[PDB]
Amino acid sequence: KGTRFERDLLVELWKAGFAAIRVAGAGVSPFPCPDIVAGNGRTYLAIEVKMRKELPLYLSADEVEQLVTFARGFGAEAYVALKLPRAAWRFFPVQMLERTEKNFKIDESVYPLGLEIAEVAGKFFQ
């Protein structure tokens, strides 16, 4: 299911004009790395991919820090892509995430602010 959904996201990214790839060993890697990397020549994305049955999404500080470090080194924008059962993929720039004392979270107050993929690509033209 998950790889179907992560491939699902890759397919959506390509339909949106990105060339995108899933990262191999994105878990057991010594280096900072996202789950997906995408680019269209203008916009470059480093994406951590999450699926939840319901809100909220919690992420660790480490996972987010590693994402940001990768994105800064690569020359990409750091995003969390979150899928809920009935929803299309929704994209959250890291700044949109809410801080708890220890973790980061997307709950119901933030989820509606998330972006569709076309909005992510459109930011370049403002």
Residues that bind a second copy (CB under 8 A): 10-11, 14, 18-26, 31-34, 37-42, 44, 70, 72-76
Q: Is 39 in the site for ligand NH4 (CB under 6 A)?
A: no
- Angle at the Cα of 110 (from 108 to 114), degrees rounded to 5? 115
How many angstroms separate the Cα of 35 from the Cα of each of 24, 72, 110?
8, 15, 22
- Angle at the Cα of 86 (from 82 to 88), degrees rounded to 5? 50
| Residue selected from 45, 47, 71, 121 as contacting ligand NH4 according to rule CB under 6 A | 121
Mask for 42-81, x = binds ligand NH4 (CB under 6 A): -----------------xx--x------------------
Residue 51 Rama label (left phi>0; alpha psi -120 to 50; beta):
beta
Residue 24: which of ligand NH4, a second copy, none does it interact with, CB under 5 to 8 A by kind? a second copy
Give me the residue whose beta carbon is nearest to ligand NH4: 17
Residue 73: which of ligand NH4, a second copy, none does it interact with, CB under 5 to 8 A by kind? a second copy
Joined tokens for residue 27: 């878990």
C-alpha–C-alpha distance, residues 93 and 103, integer Å: 16
**Rule CB under 6 A: which residues touch ligand NH4?**
17, 40, 59-60, 63, 121
